[PDB]
């Protein structure tokens, strides 16, 4: 195991950002990429804990690129 582990103050922020709630403002919408999620969060129109289905592009190593739609949280998209 690596000896560098994130300590309590950063895993507290990661646990606050990664959690999801039931009823929050700005849920149920579809976003294009990560930059649209950042632009929506920075304008204070969507909460940090909201079940928002976003679309992200990631490559796969064996390098082939692919796109898919996942139902995640706004904080997990950020």
């Amino acid at each position: 195991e690596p000896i560098i582990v994130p300590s309590q103050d950063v895993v507290l922020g990661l646990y606050y950002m990664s959690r999801a709630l039931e009823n929050k403002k700005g849920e149920g919408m579809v976003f294009a990429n990560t930059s649209e999620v950042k632009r929506a969060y920075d304008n204070r129109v969507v909460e940090l804990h909201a079940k928002v289905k976003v679309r992200i592009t990631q490559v796969d190593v064996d390098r082939t690129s692919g796109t898919s739609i996942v139902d995640t949280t706004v904080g997990r998209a950020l």
Partner: protein
């Protein structure tokens, strides 16, 4: 203390990096925030708010007849940028020619509206009898949600991130250095966007 600059580094074709001289202690963060929110949600622009695709159009995902789904078509049409003249509204029509690959430079252009990017695909066509789409442009100032209806980002920038580093002159040690990252879509320059943001903030401070 008056800073000497601003030095701008264009590391990409659309992403820039503004490096400002070391300011006084405390001015850098408030100047970065007052430039960031003004660049984010004060600069007006043009975007696409709604689309009218031919066919059934009963739901947002209940459609067929193409290689990709219509939701990916709507998300690819949402992410494109468009500028225009001082007119408020504009109606555009997009139509394909056959089973090929359509780009952003296929809309029947008007003399009043212009297209920024030409190499930007939205979908792939594999069958004949391609349907035509109708698009509408509304002028806005910031970000607007949906509340055939789509979201629209009227801001010309995509992501603005600023950071305060540590830089000191030989005389004094406690000075703040501001580095702003601007990612414009390409309808305007990044230095021009920073200049119009500073002019807007200067007019808003000179009115009061």
């Amino acid at each position: 203390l008056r800073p000497r600059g601003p030095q701008i580094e264009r590391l990409t074709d659309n992403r820039a990096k503004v490096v400002i001289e070391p300011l006084e202690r405390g001015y850098g963060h408030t100047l970065g925030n007052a430039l960031r929110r003004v660049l984010l949600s004060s600069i007006p622009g043009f975007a696409i708010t709604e689309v009218e695709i031919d066919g059934v159009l009963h739901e947002y995902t209940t459609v067929e007849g193409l290689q990709e789904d219509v939701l990916d078509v709507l998300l690819n049409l949402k992410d494109v940028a468009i500028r225009m003249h001082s007119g408020d509204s504009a109606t555009l029509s997009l139509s394909k020619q056959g089973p090929g690959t359509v780009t952003a430079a296929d809309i029947r252009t008007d003399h009043n509206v212009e297209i920024i990017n030409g190499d930007h695909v939205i979908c792939h066509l594999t069958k004949d009898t391609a349907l035509n789409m109708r698009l509408k442009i509304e002028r806005g100032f910031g970000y607007q949600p949906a509340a055939l209806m789509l979201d629209a980002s009227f801001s010309p920038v995509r992501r603005v991130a600023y950071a305060v580093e540590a830089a000191r002159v030989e005389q004094r040690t406690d000075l703040d250095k501001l580095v702003i990252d601007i990612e414009t879509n390409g309808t305007i320059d990044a230095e021009e966007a920073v200049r119009t943001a500073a002019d807007i903030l200067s007019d808003q401070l000179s009115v009061f």
